[PDB]
Unconditional design. Structure first.
Ligand code: AGS
Ligand code: AGS
Ligand code: MG
Ligand code: MG
Lengths: 406, 364, 134
């Protein structure tokens, strides 16, 4: 009953949100085998190597390293001799901070010293330790790439064994390095691509939403497996998966969609439904611009229609407030006695509000020399978007609609 | 209390689950100005009695102030000063080990997040992936009016869950406005007030705060006629002109002699091309010298070049009526522009008995 | 200029001659005023949602606003009854009467809830004119 739902909710939330390690690996057998073999070579012997892993963000770059480390550290007492250092390009943005983090992680601050002294020969002269470098591309943007060059030098030296691992999303990481470090860099690269077909993606989805064998209740787990297997071949679920697979093959988006689907699981509906997946996909695939347009007012709609008319008459040219005001006046003057008797300040405030929502952006920004009036403004919307949004507008009057059609 | 807000409340309650449970690393909430994001989120957090820190991005205009305020408020919930993001992460790991912070989700409420993209490049990616770095059951919320499309960094980061707060309607606004009726009169009286007010001003003013402010301002004149002695026609007839007078300001809430001539000459110089200058001033057929020549032409009396006119020029520059364009060190070829509205210059011309329209080349 | 005034007088005289009336009436002047005003003219006005023409829509709106403003110095059913009394000279069948009832109900509802020119005040609600319609 309720306890089983709470437990399965906790387990799946841990699986998706925190991305807890799992024994299941997809299409990465050769890459993981190579990486584990080289890690074992670097650990059981004094040899040093340098490897870079390239892949799109959200493709489980960290998972391969974590699984390999969990597999190989606990082999023998080598982990006692093995030391690991983790560096992220976001937290450590300066070489001083990187050096401080390296010293603190090694518990050598007592040996090296506590003060802010810039000397690093305490470690350099003394220098198996493994290095993990998250966002390796950021380190290449430092002033002189001193840390990377020193790491490559000590890797190429015959003093101590050092393993260097870097993570990069850019495919041009080879040209972001200087000639010296590129020459001293051992050209070991591993590429993480989603090289699998749609049926394999369906298998991945079926396995991911499958309860583990360690769940207490076994008959409920078997019924859940039957439900997910039955939901696997449903053509609506397949259509949603096909759409999301056409959009992107990254597993992070699939995890997000599965998490959002599981949110609508209550006591009255212990097992999911294809309509739940349809609702989740619909919620995940809405455009923000149309939503913003829907929440506007009548005056803003009229101003936007005038803006579209300006863009149509003057092909791809900027504009200001005065022309828009003049042609809005033209529109309200052609009509005999429509209730739109508004003064200048309210229209000016409406234009300011529209500019605040960042639907209109200035060109070659300057202030003081040019007022808000007589300022070159441009629209950031498409005509078809305006037509579609106006079609779904709840209470659009006939007059403004016909003006828009004109 | 919240009215007509039950779908989002239920969604958030389902998302939160239990205290020991985990949740999304980042949720991005966007909506309109009067959507009530702050009200709804803070009322929900107070009702659920959860550990939450409320932070204003505007007040914390510096990174050190932001981090120190967050850490100090968290410590008060459970002096500390930090300078760098890595030190902040380490201290956050140190401070979150409290028993009250052991098996509970930590919520960091941020509002007016539109300024975060202008603070630092890596601050937003660091905040987005806080749950991975800290690994301490931490959730961060965002409140903004700009869509997520403009918050995306160039390198790409962990995508937050996007959420939208629904826009209000006639019935929704009427319910909200009629909830807080004055106790000194009937509910139907205030309901009729809200009805007529909505029928008048919904076309332009959809802001709940502004419409409520207008109602508060105009209610005493609504209630005067009945005090003077349920007459709908009487009330509407007595009250209609005041409503028209009020709608004139929805969002709104004597120079010296030679100064007027300087101002009109500056306007003429700004809005008249130089090619037509002699056509308007030469008896037979912008830089400072052009202004001087035009001023000498306009004034019927011979004006001496006393330093006081230069002082008037500089004072007019100070009063933001004339804008200096050229370099400040270049006070031999200065450039000026006039920022006075056409109606203002027409009004000031009338008090002088001068017809500026006859000299404006654009109108001719 | 005065030439247009003479043309207006001639148009009024032509309207008077058309109807075989020995005297000129202001209705001719009102008819000619539109034709003098229109200038640029489209091929055909688009339909308005059963569809009704834009000119007829404006005609109904003008008539109803004029009557309400005149009465200011009403009720929904009473105003509908007046309209049916006034349009009696044109309807010749029951089907036309029910069609006119449908049209007037739709027009009143549309003006109340979309154009905001008519304001409802609390089955027979009072109707008042938005004070900014001329
Ligand atoms: N071959 C794989 N085997 C198992 N899980 C995978 C695999 N590839 C991707 N994933 C999953 O994809 C999800 C998203 O990957 P992430 O771990 O967020 O990306 P990452 O490895 O952290 O890389 P970055 O650049 O640091 S964000 C995780 O839940 C992984 O478990
Ligand atoms: N759903 C609601 N129920 C009840 N009162 C509401 C609701 N939404 C807004 N209000 C009231 O309207 C006031 C103004 O709304 P705000 O909270 O300022 O809007 P907002 O969405 O927070 O936008 P910002 O961030 O302040 S610019 C609130 O202080 C509440 O008193
Ligand atoms: Mg990672
Ligand atoms: Mg707020």
């Amino acid at each position: 009953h309720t306890e089983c739902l709470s437990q399965v909710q906790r387990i799946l939330r841990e699986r998706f949100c925190r991305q807890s390690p799992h024994s299941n690996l997809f299409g990465v057998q050769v890459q993981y085998k190579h990486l584990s073999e080289l890690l074992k070579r670097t650990a059981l012997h004094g040899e040093s190597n340098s490897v870079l892993i390239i892949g799109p963000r959200g493709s489980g770059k960290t998972m391969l390293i974590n699984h390999a480390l969990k597999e190989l550290m606990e082999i023998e007492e080598v982990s006692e001799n093995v030391l690991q250092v983790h560096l992220n390009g976001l937290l450590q943005i300066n070489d001083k901070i990187a050096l401080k983090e390296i010293t603190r992680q090694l518990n050598l601050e007592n040996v090296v010293g506590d003060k802010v002294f810039g000397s690093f020969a305490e470690n350099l002269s003394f220098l198996p330790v493994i290095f993990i470098l998250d966002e390796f591309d950021l380190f290449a943007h430092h002033k002189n790439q001193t840390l990377l060059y020193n790491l490559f030098d000590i890797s190429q030296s015959a003093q101590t064994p050092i393993a260097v691992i870097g993570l990069t999303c850019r495919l041009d990481i080879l040209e972001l390095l200087e000639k010296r470090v590129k020459s001293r860099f051992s050209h070991r690269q591993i590429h993480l691509m989603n090289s699998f077909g749609f049926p394999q993606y369906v298998k991945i989805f079926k396995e991911q939403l499958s309860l583990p064998a360690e769940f207490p209740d076994k008959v409920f787990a078997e019924k859940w497996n039957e439900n997910v297997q039955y939901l696997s071949e449903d053509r609506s679920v397949q259509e949603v998966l096909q759409k999301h697979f056409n959009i992107s093959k990254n597993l992070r988006s699939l995890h997000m969609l599965l998490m959002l689907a599981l949110n609508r699981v209550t006591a009255s509906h212990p097992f999911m439904t294809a309509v739940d997946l349809m609702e989740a996909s619909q919620l995940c695939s809405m455009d923000s611009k149309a939503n913003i347009v829907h929440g506007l007012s009548v005056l803003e709609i009229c101003l936007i229609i005038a803006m579209k008319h300006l863009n149509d008459i003057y092909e791809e040219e900027p504009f200001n407030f005065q022309m828009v005001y003049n042609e809005f006046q033209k529109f309200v003057q052609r009509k005999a006695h429509s209730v739109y008797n508004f003064e200048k300040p309210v229209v000016m405030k409406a234009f300011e509000h529209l500019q605040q929502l960042e639907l209109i952006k200035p060109m070659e920004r300057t202030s003081g020399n040019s007022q808000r009036e007589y300022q070159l403004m441009k629209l950031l919307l498409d005509n078809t978007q305006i037509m579609n949004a106006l079609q779904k507008y709840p209470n659009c009057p006939t007059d403004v609609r016909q003006w828009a059609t004109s | 209390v919240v009215l007509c807000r039950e779908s989002q409340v239920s969604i958030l309650q389902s998302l939160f689950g239990e205290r020991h449970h985990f949740s999304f690393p980042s949720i991005f909430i966007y909506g309109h100005t009067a959507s009530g994001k702050t009200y709804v989120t803070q009322t929900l957090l107070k009702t659920l009695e959860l550990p939450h820190v409320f932070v204003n991005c505007v007040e914390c205009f510096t990174l050190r102030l932001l981090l120190e305020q967050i850490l100090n408020k968290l410590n008060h919930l459970s002096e500390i000063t930090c300078e760098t993001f890595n030190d902040f992460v380490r201290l956050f790991k140190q401070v979150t080990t409290a028993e009250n912070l052991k098996d509970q989700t930590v919520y960091i409420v941020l509002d007016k997040a539109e300024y975060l993209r202008d603070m630092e490049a890596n601050l937003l990616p660091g905040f987005l992936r806080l749950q991975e770095l800290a690994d301490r059951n931490v959730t961060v919320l965002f409140l903004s009016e700009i869509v997520w499309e403009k918050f995306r960094p160039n390198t790409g980061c962990f995508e937050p869950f996007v959420l939208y707060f629904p826009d209000y309607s006639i019935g929704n606004l009427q319910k909200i406005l009629s909830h807080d009726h004055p106790p000194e009169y009937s509910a139907d009286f205030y309901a009729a007030y809200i009805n007529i007010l909505l029928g008048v001003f919904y076309t332009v003013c959809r802001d709940l705060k502004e419409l409520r402010h207008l109602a508060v301002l105009n209610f005493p004149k609504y209630c005067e006629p009945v005090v003077k002695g349920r007459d709908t026609r009487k009330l509407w007839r007595n009250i209609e002109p005041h409503l028209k007078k009020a709608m004139q300001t929805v969002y709104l809430r004597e120079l010296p002699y030679y100064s007027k001539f300087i101002l009109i000459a500056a306007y003429l110089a700004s809005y008249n091309p130089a090619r037509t200058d002699k056509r308007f001033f030469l008896k037979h057929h912008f830089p400072l010298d052009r202004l001087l020549a035009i001023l000498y032409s306009i004034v019927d009396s011979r004006v001496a070049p006393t330093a006081n006119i230069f002082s008037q020029i500089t004072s007019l520059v100070t009063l933001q009526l004339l804008t200096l364009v050229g370099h400040d060190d270049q006070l031999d070829g200065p450039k000026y522009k006039c920022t006075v509205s056409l109606d203002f210059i027409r009004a000031i011309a009338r008090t002088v008995n001068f017809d500026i329209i006859k000299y404006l080349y654009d109108f001719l | 200029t005065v030439r247009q005034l003479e043309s207006m007088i001639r148009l009024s005289e032509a309207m008077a001659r058309m109807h075989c009336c020995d005297e000129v009436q202001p209705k001719h002047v009102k008819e000619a005023f539109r034709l003098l005003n229109k200038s640029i003219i489209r091929v055909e006005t688009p339909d308005v949602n059963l569809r009704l023409g834009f000119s007829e829509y404006c005609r109904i709106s003008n008539l109803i606003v004029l009557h309400l403003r005149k009465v200011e110095e009403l009720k929904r059913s009473e105003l509908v009854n007046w309209y049916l009394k006034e349009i009696e000279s044109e309807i010749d069948s029951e089907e036309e009467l029910i069609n006119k009832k449908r049209i007037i109900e739709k027009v009143i509802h549309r003006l109340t809830h979309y154009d905001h020119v008519l304001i409802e005040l609390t089955e027979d609600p009072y109707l008042v004119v938005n004070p900014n319609y001329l």
